[PDB]
Amino acid sequence: MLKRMYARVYGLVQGVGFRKFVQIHAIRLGIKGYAKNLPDGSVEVVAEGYEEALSKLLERIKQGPPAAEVEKVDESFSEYKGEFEDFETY
């Protein structure tokens, strides 16, 4: 069940190891896509992979790394486009 998952992460989420934490867990789970800093201070994640893997990554995203303080994750699921070959951070 390949899917694409979009996640917007609000809170104390920049300067705290967030993008690397998502990347590591994505690589561990076989997920491709990206985690990106946004100018407003939040982070966005686009992830493609099997549903079960995406759900595991979502759980990680909601927690964040130890220095993060996640206020809310907004997520949305949609069709897998097979757009990515790696998991990148920007």
N, CA, C and O atoms as a MOPAC input file, in Angstrom:
PM7 MOZYME 1SCF
protein

 N      0.81100 1    -1.22000 1     0.00000 1
 C      0.00000 1     0.00000 1     0.00000 1
 C      0.84600 1     1.27300 1     0.00000 1
 O      0.91000 1     1.99000 1     0.99800 1
 N      1.49000 1     1.54000 1    -1.12900 1
 C      2.26800 1     2.76000 1    -1.28200 1
 C      1.34600 1     3.97400 1    -1.19300 1
 O      0.24000 1     3.96800 1    -1.73300 1
 N      1.81600 1     5.01100 1    -0.50700 1
 C      1.07600 1     6.26000 1    -0.36100 1
 C      2.06300 1     7.41200 1    -0.27400 1
 O      3.25700 1     7.18700 1    -0.07400 1
 N      1.58300 1     8.64500 1    -0.42200 1
 C      2.39300 1     9.81000 1    -0.11000 1
 C      1.80400 1    10.41100 1     1.15000 1
 O      0.58300 1    10.45600 1     1.29700 1
 N      2.64900 1    10.87600 1     2.06400 1
 C      2.12800 1    11.52100 1     3.27200 1
 C      2.72600 1    12.89500 1     3.36700 1
 O      3.93700 1    13.06100 1     3.22300 1
 N      1.88200 1    13.89900 1     3.61000 1
 C      2.35500 1    15.26500 1     3.84800 1
 C      2.22100 1    15.58800 1     5.31200 1
 O      1.19900 1    15.26100 1     5.91500 1
 N      3.22800 1    16.23000 1     5.91900 1
 C      3.08200 1    16.56600 1     7.33700 1
 C      3.65600 1    17.92800 1     7.58400 1
 O      4.78900 1    18.21700 1     7.19900 1
 N      2.87900 1    18.76500 1     8.22600 1
 C      3.34200 1    20.09800 1     8.65700 1
 C      3.50400 1    20.06500 1    10.17800 1
 O      2.57400 1    19.70700 1    10.90100 1
 N      4.69600 1    20.44200 1    10.65700 1
 C      5.03500 1    20.34900 1    12.05000 1
 C      5.24200 1    21.72800 1    12.66600 1
 O      6.10800 1    22.49000 1    12.23700 1
 N      4.43400 1    22.03600 1    13.67700 1
 C      4.55100 1    23.32500 1    14.36400 1
 C      5.11800 1    23.12600 1    15.75900 1
 O      4.98100 1    22.05600 1    16.35300 1
 N      5.76200 1    24.18100 1    16.27900 1
 C      6.34300 1    24.17000 1    17.60800 1
 C      7.79600 1    24.61700 1    17.59400 1
 O      8.23600 1    25.29600 1    16.66600 1
 N      8.54800 1    24.22900 1    18.63600 1
 C      9.99600 1    24.45700 1    18.71700 1
 C     10.62000 1    23.32000 1    17.91700 1
 O     10.90100 1    22.24700 1    18.45200 1
 N     10.83200 1    23.57100 1    16.63000 1
 C     11.16300 1    22.49900 1    15.68500 1
 C     12.31800 1    22.81000 1    14.75500 1
 O     12.72500 1    21.94600 1    13.97900 1
 N     12.86600 1    24.03600 1    14.81100 1
 C     14.08100 1    24.34300 1    14.11000 1
 C     15.21300 1    24.50100 1    15.12100 1
 O     14.96900 1    24.84000 1    16.27900 1
 N     16.44900 1    24.25700 1    14.68900 1
 C     17.59700 1    24.33500 1    15.58600 1
 C     17.69300 1    23.19800 1    16.61200 1
 O     18.43100 1    23.30400 1    17.59100 1
 N     16.95100 1    22.12100 1    16.38600 1
 C     16.82000 1    21.08000 1    17.42300 1
 C     17.04700 1    19.69400 1    16.83400 1
 O     16.71300 1    18.69800 1    17.47600 1
 N     17.60500 1    19.60300 1    15.63100 1
 C     17.90100 1    18.27100 1    15.11900 1
 C     16.72200 1    17.61800 1    14.42900 1
 O     16.74400 1    16.41400 1    14.17300 1
 N     15.68500 1    18.39700 1    14.12200 1
 C     14.45200 1    17.79600 1    13.54600 1
 C     14.59900 1    17.16700 1    12.17800 1
 O     14.13900 1    16.04600 1    11.95700 1
 N     15.23500 1    17.87400 1    11.25300 1
 C     15.31600 1    17.38900 1     9.88500 1
 C     16.18300 1    16.12200 1     9.84700 1
 O     15.85100 1    15.16200 1     9.15100 1
 N     17.28500 1    16.12200 1    10.59100 1
 C     18.14100 1    14.93200 1    10.63500 1
 C     17.40900 1    13.76100 1    11.30000 1
 O     17.54300 1    12.61700 1    10.86500 1
 N     16.64200 1    14.04400 1    12.34500 1
 C     15.89200 1    13.00800 1    13.01500 1
 C     14.88300 1    12.37600 1    12.03600 1
 O     14.78400 1    11.15100 1    11.95700 1
 N     14.14400 1    13.20200 1    11.29900 1
 C     13.21800 1    12.63900 1    10.30900 1
 C     13.94300 1    11.83700 1     9.21600 1
 O     13.53700 1    10.72700 1     8.86800 1
 N     15.00400 1    12.41400 1     8.69400 1
 C     15.78900 1    11.73000 1     7.68200 1
 C     16.27600 1    10.36500 1     8.14800 1
 O     16.13200 1     9.37500 1     7.43100 1
 N     16.85300 1    10.30800 1     9.34800 1
 C     17.35300 1     9.02100 1     9.86000 1
 C     16.23400 1     7.99900 1     9.95200 1
 O     16.38400 1     6.85600 1     9.52100 1
 N     15.11100 1     8.42200 1    10.51700 1
 C     14.02100 1     7.48000 1    10.66300 1
 C     13.44800 1     7.09200 1     9.31700 1
 O     13.04100 1     5.94700 1     9.12000 1
 N     13.41300 1     8.04200 1     8.38100 1
 C     12.92800 1     7.71000 1     7.03000 1
 C     13.83500 1     6.68600 1     6.36400 1
 O     13.35000 1     5.72600 1     5.76600 1
 N     15.14800 1     6.88100 1     6.46100 1
 C     16.09000 1     5.94800 1     5.83800 1
 C     15.92100 1     4.58600 1     6.49600 1
 O     15.94800 1     3.55300 1     5.82700 1
 N     15.74300 1     4.59600 1     7.82600 1
 C     15.56200 1     3.33900 1     8.54400 1
 C     14.33400 1     2.56400 1     8.07800 1
 O     14.34800 1     1.33500 1     8.00500 1
 N     13.27800 1     3.30100 1     7.76800 1
 C     11.97600 1     2.75600 1     7.36200 1
 C     11.80100 1     2.55300 1     5.86000 1
 O     10.77300 1     2.03400 1     5.42500 1
 N     12.78900 1     2.95300 1     5.06500 1
 C     12.69600 1     2.80900 1     3.62100 1
 C     11.81100 1     3.84000 1     2.94300 1
 O     11.21000 1     3.56700 1     1.90400 1
 N     11.73300 1     5.03000 1     3.53400 1
 C     10.89900 1     6.11400 1     3.04600 1
 C     11.72600 1     7.13900 1     2.27700 1
 O     12.86300 1     7.43900 1     2.64200 1
 N     11.14300 1     7.66800 1     1.21400 1
 C     11.81600 1     8.63500 1     0.36800 1
 C     11.02000 1     9.94500 1     0.46800 1
 O      9.86300 1     9.92500 1     0.88800 1
 N     11.62100 1    11.08000 1     0.08700 1
 C     10.94400 1    12.35600 1     0.13600 1
 C     11.89000 1    13.34700 1     0.79300 1
 O     13.09600 1    13.31200 1     0.54500 1
 N     11.35700 1    14.23000 1     1.62800 1
 C     12.17300 1    15.32100 1     2.18100 1
 C     11.57400 1    15.93100 1     3.44900 1
 O     10.36900 1    15.84100 1     3.68500 1
 N     12.42800 1    16.55200 1     4.25700 1
 C     12.01400 1    17.38300 1     5.36700 1
 C     12.62300 1    18.75000 1     5.08700 1
 O     13.80400 1    18.84500 1     4.75200 1
 N     11.82800 1    19.81000 1     5.22100 1
 C     12.26800 1    21.14600 1     4.80700 1
 C     11.89200 1    22.18200 1     5.84400 1
 O     10.76300 1    22.19900 1     6.33400 1
 N     12.84000 1    23.05000 1     6.18200 1
 C     12.51700 1    24.22000 1     6.99600 1
 C     11.71500 1    25.25400 1     6.21400 1
 O     11.96700 1    25.49400 1     5.03300 1
 N     10.74500 1    25.86000 1     6.89200 1
 C      9.91500 1    26.92000 1     6.30100 1
 C     10.20500 1    28.23200 1     6.99500 1
 O     10.59000 1    28.24100 1     8.16500 1
 N     10.02500 1    29.35400 1     6.29000 1
 C     10.42200 1    30.65500 1     6.83600 1
 C      9.68600 1    31.05400 1     8.09100 1
 O     10.19000 1    31.85000 1     8.88300 1
 N      8.49500 1    30.50900 1     8.28200 1
 C      7.72400 1    30.87200 1     9.46900 1
 C      8.23100 1    30.21900 1    10.75700 1
 O      7.78700 1    30.57800 1    11.84700 1
 N      9.15900 1    29.26300 1    10.63900 1
 C      9.69600 1    28.60000 1    11.80600 1
 C      9.26400 1    27.14500 1    11.91000 1
 O      9.79100 1    26.40000 1    12.73600 1
 N      8.31300 1    26.73400 1    11.08400 1
 C      7.79900 1    25.37800 1    11.13900 1
 C      8.59100 1    24.48600 1    10.17800 1
 O      9.51900 1    24.94700 1     9.51300 1
 N      8.21400 1    23.20700 1    10.11500 1
 C      8.88800 1    22.23800 1     9.24200 1
 C      7.84800 1    21.50100 1     8.43400 1
 O      6.74200 1    21.26800 1     8.92000 1
 N      8.17900 1    21.12600 1     7.20400 1
 C      7.27100 1    20.36600 1     6.36700 1
 C      7.95700 1    19.08200 1     5.97100 1
 O      9.16300 1    19.06500 1     5.72400 1
 N      7.18900 1    17.99600 1     5.90800 1
 C      7.71700 1    16.70900 1     5.51800 1
 C      6.84700 1    16.15600 1     4.40200 1
 O      5.62000 1    16.17100 1     4.49900 1
 N      7.48400 1    15.66700 1     3.33700 1
 C      6.74800 1    14.94700 1     2.30900 1
 C      7.40200 1    13.59200 1     2.25100 1
 O      8.61700 1    13.49300 1     2.07900 1
 N      6.60900 1    12.53800 1     2.39200 1
 C      7.18200 1    11.19800 1     2.50300 1
 C      6.40700 1    10.22100 1     1.63800 1
 O      5.17700 1    10.24500 1     1.60700 1
 N      7.13600 1     9.35700 1     0.93300 1
 C      6.51500 1     8.31200 1     0.11600 1
 C      7.03800 1     6.94300 1     0.50800 1
 O      8.23100 1     6.76700 1     0.75700 1
 N      6.13100 1     5.97400 1     0.56000 1
 C      6.50500 1     4.65800 1     1.03300 1
 C      5.28500 1     3.80500 1     1.33700 1
 O      4.15400 1     4.21200 1     1.07000 1
 N      5.51200 1     2.61600 1     1.89900 1
 C      4.38400 1     1.79500 1     2.31300 1
 C      3.65600 1     2.41500 1     3.50400 1
 O      4.28100 1     3.02300 1     4.37300 1
 N      2.33500 1     2.25900 1     3.54000 1
 C      1.53400 1     2.88200 1     4.59300 1
 C      2.04200 1     2.58900 1     5.98400 1
 O      2.16100 1     3.49800 1     6.80500 1
 N      2.34700 1     1.32500 1     6.26400 1
 C      2.78500 1     0.93300 1     7.60000 1
 C      4.05000 1     1.68700 1     7.99200 1
 O      4.21300 1     2.07600 1     9.14800 1
 N      4.94600 1     1.89300 1     7.02300 1
 C      6.17300 1     2.62900 1     7.27000 1
 C      5.88600 1     4.09700 1     7.51200 1
 O      6.44600 1     4.69700 1     8.42900 1
 N      5.00900 1     4.68600 1     6.69200 1
 C      4.61200 1     6.08100 1     6.86800 1
 C      4.01500 1     6.31400 1     8.26700 1
 O      4.30600 1     7.32400 1     8.90700 1
 N      3.18300 1     5.37900 1     8.73200 1
 C      2.55900 1     5.51700 1    10.05300 1
 C      3.61600 1     5.50400 1    11.13900 1
 O      3.53600 1     6.27100 1    12.09800 1
 N      4.61400 1     4.62900 1    10.99200 1
 C      5.72400 1     4.66100 1    11.93700 1
 C      6.46400 1     6.00000 1    11.90100 1
 O      6.83900 1     6.52200 1    12.95000 1
 N      6.67700 1     6.55800 1    10.71200 1
 C      7.37300 1     7.82500 1    10.64400 1
 C      6.52300 1     8.92400 1    11.26300 1
 O      7.03900 1     9.79800 1    11.96000 1
 N      5.22300 1     8.88000 1    11.00900 1
 C      4.31800 1     9.84700 1    11.59900 1
 C      4.42900 1     9.83900 1    13.12500 1
 O      4.44900 1    10.90200 1    13.74700 1
 N      4.50000 1     8.66000 1    13.73100 1
 C      4.61500 1     8.59900 1    15.16800 1
 C      5.87800 1     9.31700 1    15.64300 1
 O      5.85900 1    10.03700 1    16.64100 1
 N      6.97200 1     9.11000 1    14.91200 1
 C      8.23600 1     9.77300 1    15.22300 1
 C      8.14300 1    11.28100 1    15.06800 1
 O      8.66600 1    12.03300 1    15.89000 1
 N      7.47800 1    11.71500 1    14.01300 1
 C      7.30800 1    13.15100 1    13.74300 1
 C      6.52800 1    13.86100 1    14.85600 1
 O      6.82500 1    15.00600 1    15.19900 1
 N      5.53500 1    13.17500 1    15.41200 1
 C      4.71500 1    13.74000 1    16.46500 1
 C      5.49400 1    13.92900 1    17.76800 1
 O      5.16600 1    14.79300 1    18.58100 1
 N      6.52000 1    13.11500 1    17.95000 1
 C      7.34400 1    13.16900 1    19.14600 1
 C      8.44600 1    14.16600 1    18.96400 1
 O      8.70900 1    14.99400 1    19.83600 1
 N      9.10700 1    14.08100 1    17.80000 1
 C     10.26600 1    14.86700 1    17.52500 1
 C     11.48400 1    14.29800 1    18.24200 1
 O     11.36700 1    13.38200 1    19.05600 1
 N     12.65600 1    14.85100 1    17.93100 1
 C     13.87300 1    14.53900 1    18.68500 1
 C     13.79400 1    15.13900 1    20.08700 1
 O     12.89800 1    15.93800 1    20.36000 1
 N     14.71900 1    14.76800 1    20.98700 1
 C     14.61700 1    15.18400 1    22.39400 1
 C     14.52300 1    16.69500 1    22.61900 1
 O     13.82600 1    17.11500 1    23.54300 1
 N     15.19400 1    17.53400 1    21.81300 1
 C     15.14500 1    18.99600 1    22.06700 1
 C     13.93800 1    19.65400 1    21.43700 1
 O     13.68000 1    20.83100 1    21.69200 1
 N     13.19200 1    18.92900 1    20.62200 1
 C     12.06000 1    19.58400 1    19.98400 1
 C     10.88900 1    19.60700 1    20.96400 1
 O     10.79100 1    18.78700 1    21.87600 1
 N     10.00700 1    20.58000 1    20.73700 1
 C      8.72700 1    20.68300 1    21.44300 1
 C      7.65300 1    20.80000 1    20.36700 1
 O      7.37200 1    21.89400 1    19.87600 1
 N      7.05900 1    19.67100 1    20.00500 1
 C      6.07300 1    19.65100 1    18.91800 1
 C      4.70900 1    20.06000 1    19.43800 1
 O      4.16800 1    19.41900 1    20.33900 1
 N      4.14500 1    21.13300 1    18.87300 1
 C      2.80000 1    21.55500 1    19.26700 1
 C      1.70600 1    20.83100 1    18.50000 1
 O      0.67700 1    20.48300 1    19.07900 1
 N      1.90800 1    20.59700 1    17.20400 1
 C      0.84600 1    20.00400 1    16.39500 1
 C      1.49400 1    19.51300 1    15.14800 1
 O      2.36400 1    20.17500 1    14.58400 1
 N      1.07100 1    18.33600 1    14.70300 1
 C      1.33300 1    17.88000 1    13.36300 1
 C      0.02300 1    17.84500 1    12.58400 1
 O     -0.95300 1    17.24400 1    13.03400 1
 N      0.00000 1    18.48500 1    11.42200 1
 C     -1.10000 1    18.33000 1    10.49900 1
 C     -0.67300 1    17.37000 1     9.42500 1
 O      0.30700 1    17.64000 1     8.73100 1
 N     -1.36500 1    16.24800 1     9.25200 1
 C     -0.94700 1    15.38400 1     8.15700 1
 C     -2.07400 1    15.05100 1     7.18100 1
 O     -3.25400 1    15.16400 1     7.51500 1
 N     -1.69400 1    14.63800 1     5.97000 1
 C     -2.64300 1    14.33500 1     4.91700 1
 C     -2.06300 1    13.20600 1     4.05800 1
 O     -0.86700 1    13.20400 1     3.76700 1
 N     -2.89600 1    12.25500 1     3.65500 1
 C     -2.42400 1    11.12600 1     2.85100 1
 C     -2.97500 1    11.21600 1     1.43200 1
 O     -4.12000 1    11.62200 1     1.23500 1
 N     -2.16200 1    10.83900 1     0.44100 1
 C     -2.55900 1    10.92100 1    -0.96700 1
 C     -1.80300 1     9.93100 1    -1.82900 1
 O     -1.00200 1     9.14100 1    -1.32800 1
 N     -2.06000 1     9.97500 1    -3.13500 1
 C     -1.48700 1     8.99800 1    -4.07300 1
 C      0.03900 1     9.08900 1    -4.16200 1
 O      0.61700 1    10.17100 1    -4.26700 1
 N      0.66000 1     7.92200 1    -4.11600 1
 C      2.09100 1     7.74700 1    -4.28200 1
 C      2.42200 1     8.12700 1    -5.70700 1
 O      1.84400 1     7.58100 1    -6.64700 1
 N      3.34800 1     9.05900 1    -5.87900 1
 C      3.73800 1     9.47400 1    -7.20800 1
 C      5.06000 1     8.85300 1    -7.64000 1
 O      5.43100 1     8.94500 1    -8.81100 1
 N      5.77700 1     8.22300 1    -6.71200 1
 C      7.07000 1     7.65800 1    -7.02300 1
 C      8.00900 1     8.73000 1    -7.52200 1
 O      8.69800 1     8.54700 1    -8.52600 1
 N      8.03700 1     9.85900 1    -6.81700 1
 C      8.76700 1    11.04300 1    -7.25600 1
 C     10.24300 1    11.10300 1    -6.80600 1
 O     11.02800 1    11.86900 1    -7.36400 1
 N     10.61300 1    10.30400 1    -5.80900 1
 C     11.85300 1    10.53500 1    -5.06700 1
 C     12.77000 1     9.33000 1    -5.15700 1
 O     12.30000 1     8.20700 1    -5.34200 1
 N     14.07400 1     9.54700 1    -5.02800 1
 C     14.99500 1     8.42300 1    -4.99400 1
 C     15.73600 1     8.34000 1    -3.66200 1
 O     16.36100 1     7.32400 1    -3.35900 1
 N     15.66600 1     9.40800 1    -2.86800 1
 C     16.31100 1     9.48300 1    -1.56300 1
 C     15.39700 1    10.17300 1    -0.56100 1
 O     14.28200 1    10.57800 1    -0.89000 1
 N     15.88800 1    10.29900 1     0.66200 1
 C     15.26700 1    11.19700 1     1.60400 1
 C     16.18200 1    12.38100 1     1.91000 1
 O     17.25100 1    12.21200 1     2.49700 1
 N     15.75800 1    13.57200 1     1.51200 1
 C     16.64300 1    14.71800 1     1.61400 1
 C     16.17600 1    15.70900 1     2.65100 1
 O     15.02500 1    15.67700 1     3.08700 1
 N     17.07700 1    16.59200 1     3.04400 1
 C     16.69600 1    17.64400 1     3.97900 1
 C     17.13200 1    18.94800 1     3.39500 1
 O     18.21700 1    19.07300 1     2.82600 1
 N     16.25300 1    19.93600 1     3.54600 1
 C     16.45700 1    21.26700 1     2.98100 1
 C     16.07100 1    22.36700 1     3.94600 1
 O     16.18600 1    23.54700 1     3.61500 1

